[PDB]
Design a protein around this ligand. Sequence first.
Ligand SMILES: [Zn+2]
Ligand SMILES: [Zn+2]
Ligand SMILES: [Zn+2]
Lengths: 98, 48, 58, 510, 40, 202, 107, 98, 52
Amino acid sequence: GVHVSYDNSIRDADGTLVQFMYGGDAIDITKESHMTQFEFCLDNYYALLKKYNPSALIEHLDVESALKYSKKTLKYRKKHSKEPHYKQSVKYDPVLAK
Amino acid sequence: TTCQFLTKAVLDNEREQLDSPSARIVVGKLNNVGTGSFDVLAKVPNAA
Amino acid sequence: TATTLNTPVVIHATQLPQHVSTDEVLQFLESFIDEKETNLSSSISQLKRIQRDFKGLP
Amino acid sequence: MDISKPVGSEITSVDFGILTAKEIRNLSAKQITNPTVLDNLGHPVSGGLYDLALGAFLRNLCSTCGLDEKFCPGHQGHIELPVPCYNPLFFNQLYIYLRASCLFCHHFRLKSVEVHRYACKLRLLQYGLIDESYKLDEITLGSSTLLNELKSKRSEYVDMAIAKALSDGRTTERGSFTATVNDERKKLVHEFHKKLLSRGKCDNCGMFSPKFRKDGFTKIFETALNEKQITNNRVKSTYILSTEVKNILDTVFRKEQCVLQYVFHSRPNLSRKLVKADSFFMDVLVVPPTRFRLPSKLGEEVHENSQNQLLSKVLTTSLLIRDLNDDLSKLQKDKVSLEDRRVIFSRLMNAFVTIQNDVNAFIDSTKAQGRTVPIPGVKQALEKKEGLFRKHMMGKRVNYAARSVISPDPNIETNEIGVPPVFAVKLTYPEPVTAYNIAELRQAVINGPDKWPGATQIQNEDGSLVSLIGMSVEQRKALANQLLTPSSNVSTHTLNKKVYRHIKNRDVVL
Amino acid sequence: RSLINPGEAVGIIASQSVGEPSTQMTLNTNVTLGIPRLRE
Amino acid sequence: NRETARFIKKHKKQVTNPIDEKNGTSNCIVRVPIALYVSLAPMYLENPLQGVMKQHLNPLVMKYNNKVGGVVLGYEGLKILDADPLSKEDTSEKLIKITPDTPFGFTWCHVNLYVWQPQVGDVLEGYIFIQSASHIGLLIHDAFNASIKKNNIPVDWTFVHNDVEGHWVDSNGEPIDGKLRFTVRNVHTTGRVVSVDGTLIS
Amino acid sequence: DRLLNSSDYTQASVCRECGSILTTQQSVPRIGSISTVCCRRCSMRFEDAKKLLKIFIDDSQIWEDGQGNKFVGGNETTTVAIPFVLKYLDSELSAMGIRLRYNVEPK
Amino acid sequence: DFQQHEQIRRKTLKEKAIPKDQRATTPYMTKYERARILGTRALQISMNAPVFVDLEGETDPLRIAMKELAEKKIPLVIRRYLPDGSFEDWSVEELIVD
Amino acid sequence: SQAESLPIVSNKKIVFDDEVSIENKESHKELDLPEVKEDNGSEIVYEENTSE
Ligand SMILES: [Zn+2]
Ligand SMILES: [Zn+2]
Ligand SMILES: [Zn+2]
């Protein structure tokens, strides 16, 4: 019964929770292959983008809010970067948790 | 231990709320999996 | 016979039954006989005979 | 199943409970008392194990619902045990509460104020108030009068708290039950179990109760009292019948009801139903409907259902009982010596045993003596090979399927599967009949069951099947054009016929 | 667009990604290894 | 007992029909609001209101029904209760749960029910239509059967028959015919249609 | 599909009251009546009820069985689909004195 | 007293649902949502349901449903359940297809 | 004492089952088996051991 709900959490059938995200990032094990093949990516760009087609999801998705936070966490990451894992600045949680 | 676990339910008067897949297969209710996480509705007009 | 196709599995009454005078009865008979104009036709034929009884006739 | 017979009625939840002698004697269509099953020509003996009041049998009609061997869903009957007998499945739990029971003040031989505490927890633990359960023990402010004040304060909290947690969304009335909450429960419960058995001298009156012994064949003995215990008992070993046990326990289950209420319920009891001791006792067995207890056929010669044979032993036995009993009433009580009482008790002990044994012999062949191979009982039935469940509920053999050796082919496509003729002509999918397909389904029906593409049968609007089997052109030809006929029944007018066409390349297969 | 779809019984799926490869560990090449190590 | 072996009470039909109007006849007609859980064909996907009538409502008219306690006469105002409990009661469009297996669906709705429901003991008049040496047959409001048993007729009435090609005669000597005034003693409903068992004595 | 719809999927009745499928029978109807579905566990014998003492009896309530006893009440039934074996199971369970009471909906 | 139980059922059910403006789930049609969309509707179409598209020569209830979803005419809706009773209602037409 | 010559069940049982064990096999030998192609085309088989 373990599955991914509609809230991105990983619960059993009885509601009991096991994880708060799949791989801790919630990525499909198959849509992965070329998720980081940046090379073979900027190659065919125009083909890739044709497939995904931004112009559609425009009015649907938030294009900002998230990004704004992806720069705050990066800043405060390189700030408390060096220090050990128990001195971390819990001041900024990942972008995925919010 | 099919028999014993049974005793665990009777002696607790447990309510098996037919949730876990295993529990449904017996009753035949559609499982929580994928095509059984949501539902279906008919957008029918002429109701006012 | 009585299938789930043409018969509700369960039905209940919200309020409590309420008496109605003969007048209301007729005005109802009317509105319902007019609306319906297939076994519905052999039945309303039985109604029209009772609406004709609430005025005095065979 | 069909796409035109739905139902909006469905069970939401399932519960498990004991069968009281009441519901049983009320729902039972017939009582069973006779061993033999058939007369001298092959007919259901009255009160026999195949009486028709349990489900149609042979060529006869059910004497309860009026259907036959095809349609009679069977109606469980019953068997009356002319003596109380421990349920072999719960004998263990029975034993526990027996030894912990004081046989004088009818409480548990554990402290009353404690048992109280424990109850409170369980109650909180039906609502997931794990903290409150432990935040309840933190109470001993400040003889005898002081004790009634604690048992009060502890309570008015635990109870109050449940209202606090009910006032917000933390719990409903049915309860909150998760993997977690569940834990602290099963833990705490067992803790209460050990503290019960632990106490030897009763703390609620100061009396010692002679301890009990056990057998595997569910036979409770009673050893006498130690030297210091006879002494302490006045300052303040033999078989004991299955009924003597019933009584003692009962009174205890009537006094200490309070706690047992939250011992036997994982959720708050919305039915407020009493918890009696008779739960662990079987005075009446439920004879399953005949339609289950069907004998086997060795192709030709028939074999008696096993389970039946077992019940028959119960019967034959159950008889000798009322026989010895009606004989107990012919011995005038002036000739009954105090010595003769002893050889009497023997006959009695003898009964309760052999009957109880046979009872188990059907429930669990384990807790039953040997004949030599033994006869499968309920238990050895639920776990048949992998388990009745995995073998026939998670592992069902099904219609519309076919295994065949597999050979290669690069000419078809990857997403393809080669379909051999000798198959497709036998595999058929129920397609709805309308306008879009009418062109097709027509043609097919014509070609009949032996020419691909085509079909083998037609479902009208009333569900009846139409085998185009031994049919030829004409008969088909006609039945064909009748695909778009109206409804004779105003009930099923919404339905259209369904043709059972051959499996074509447009379809899909697993 | 490369996310995992709400629903997938990743649980069951994982039980597979374990039980299937554990069939190549039929043979033998310090510690505990293979079929047993999984038992523990 | 506790509260269960005394809840069989909720069963005495709480609709006492009166002998008002002075006519001496009991007023029986009644208005009762109810609920309704039904199935809709894929065909009437665009004709919801309709399908309910052709599928369920219509095959009730002039038939006894075990629930209302009486005979169905007709309905008023078949309103739909949307499945999306947030929309305006407007939007002519209204969702409804769809059966797991089949394309059909179900919902709850409200509708007023006008019903005849004579309970044992009431008094009514009926046009006689037949007479045999055992029973008096009549029709209340020209529709519903009714039967007066032999030993329910006044133990002084008399019976006779004709010849040229039967009939009763009351206390005095006039052959009773047309408007008879009985009182319901029983009600047989399990048959093909309704059935009224009356009398006419103390 | 593979584990019901083409295996042992069966329709059956259920007493809405006590939630049972083991006691749901047909009504032995008088010649010229339709067969009802009632619950033998929730019904009373007509004679036993008459002992409840000032209202009058009812018709559609009564129902006779095959043997010839008259009964009343317990006419709260419904229809549902389940795998056959489930029945068999319950039967065996009840042979130990274990009842299943599956709260039935829509209540 | 059933008017009382009906008042509670109809109150609770509403509370459960989530207003269309507070919808915080993926606006993408899901793998499972798609497979059932065409299927169920096909069952409808196969049983004389109103066809909002042109058949152009179809003889399969499925392929139809396909052509239907295509032009986005499928007048159906899905009840997405959060593993806690709460839920948002989304229509096929308002969801992105892929 | 009407208990000094009162039998004990353990032994009366062993005689009772004997006969009964017969009037069940023998009586089952003078019986036919009526096939009920349960409304489907199937076949209501009459066994009690599908050992798969
Ligand atoms: Zn039957
Ligand atoms: Zn004591
Ligand atoms: Zn019942």
